[PDB]
Design a protein around this ligand. Structure first.
Ligand code: HEC
Length: 89
């Protein structure tokens, strides 16, 4: 009910382009650890993920006006955890 919320948020809003941690729109801009340290502003850290979800980037939409801060934290922890544990799909 935090990490699960994040998984809940991931599935409902993120899976459309990040199915299984990949990136349908920008294939290279993947959700696994290596891609994140390479492409994510600020690097691989939960705070950088949060910032990208809130603000969006390029073809990635901003979720600040749709999700709560709490869910944005939750989903960032989820992405962070999946990449660290390499649990994608
Ligand atoms: C498709 C319309 C998208 C939805 C739905 C979400 N994201 Fe996304 N994301 C998408 C693109 C096109 C990009 C790259 C943007 C760019 O031009 O750089 C991204 C990137 C990410 C990343 C960074 C991945 C990396 O750099 O390797 C993260 C952390 C990310 N996206 C997370 C994320 C979450 C948690 C979403 C659900 C709320 C979400 N994205 C939705 C396309 C789309």
């Amino acid at each position: 009910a935090d990490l699960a919320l994040g998984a809940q948020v991931f599935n409902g809003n993120c899976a459309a382009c990040h199915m299984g941690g990949r990136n349908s729109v920008m294939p290279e801009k993947t959700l696994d650890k290596a891609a994140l340290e390479q492409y994510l502003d600020g690097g691989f850290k939960v705070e950088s993920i949060i910032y990208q979800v809130e603000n969006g980037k390029g073809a990635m939409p901003a979720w600040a006006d749709r999700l709560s801060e709490e869910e944005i934290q939750a989903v960032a922890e989820y992405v962070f955890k999946q990449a660290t544990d390499a649990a994608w799909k």
